[PDB]
């Protein structure tokens, strides 16, 4: 079940985000500001429809999806992708596909913290979120 993921979460640690963003071709100036941004992520559910909000002073996104059903997405860096999110080994696994490329955004609860692992190419970023509410 998804239920321990639900709520409001704040970024408290980030490792290799610049490498991940550079791998996606994000420009230097956007990486600069993103490296100093601390987002809030809000995860809500209504039945098997999940809504994932990511808020900040820089960029803001919102997606809604049905678990295990593909959806179109336009990412914070303006990639137009085909996406699917599923529970897999108790993790929320978000797979984005575009132009034959793939990136995964994997969320796992470890000791009450939500660990977001971002993989594109060889770049692996780990971001740790702490529960606000
Ligand atoms: C909405 C805020 C996202 C994080 C700061 C802006 C970064 C914009 C350029 C890179 C976007 C890459 C895809 C989205 C990464 C999501 C990271 C996260 O939720 O912590």
Ligand 1 pocket by Cβ (under 6 Å): 11, 21, 26, 30, 34, 37, 39, 41, 54, 56, 58-61, 75-77, 116, 127
State which approach was used to obtain the coordinates: X-ray
C-beta of residue 109 within 8 angstroms of C-beta of residue 5: yes
d(CA 24, CA 19): 9
Asked if 114 contacts 128 with a C-beta cutoff of 8 angstroms, the reply is yes
Give the residue before each break in the chain, using a C-to-N cut-off of over 2.5 angstroms; say none if it is continuous. Answer: none
Testing ligand 1's pocket by substitution, the residue of 38, 59, 60, 120 carrying the most ligand atoms inside 8 A of its CB is 59
What's the farthest any 2 CA atoms get from each other in the chain? 40
| Gap between the Cα atoms of 89 and 108, Å rounded | 9
Distance CA 16, CA 132 (A): 24
Sheet holding 71-74, edge to edge: 61-66, 49-55, 40-46, 7-15, 123-131, 113-120, 101-110, 91-98, 80-88, 71-74
What number does the ligand 1 atom closest to the CA of 41 have?
Answer: 19
User: Which residue range is the domain that position 108 belongs to?
Assistant: 1-133
Count of structural domains, the chain: 1
Task: Give 70-113 as a DSSP string.
Answer: -EEEE-TT--EEEEEEEEETTEEEEEEEETTEEEEEEEEEETTE
């Amino acid at each position: 079940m998804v239920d321990a993921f639900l709520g409001t979460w704040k970024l408290v640690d980030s490792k290799n985000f610049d490498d991940y963003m550079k791998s996606l071709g994000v420009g230097f100036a956007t990486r600069q500001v993103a490296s100093m941004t601390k987002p809030t992520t809000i995860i809500e559910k209504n039945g098997d429809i999940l809504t994932l909000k990511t808020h900040s002073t820089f960029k803001n996104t919102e997606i809604s999806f049905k678990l295990g059903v593909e959806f179109d997405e336009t990412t914070a860096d303006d990639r137009k992708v085909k996406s699917i999110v599923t529970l897999d080994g108790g993790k929320l696994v978000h797979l984005q596909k575009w132009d034959g490329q793939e990136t995964t955004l994997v969320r796992e609860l470890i000791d009450g913290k939500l660990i977001l692992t971002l993989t594109h190419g060889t770049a692996v970023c780990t971001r740790t979120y702490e529960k606000e509410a």
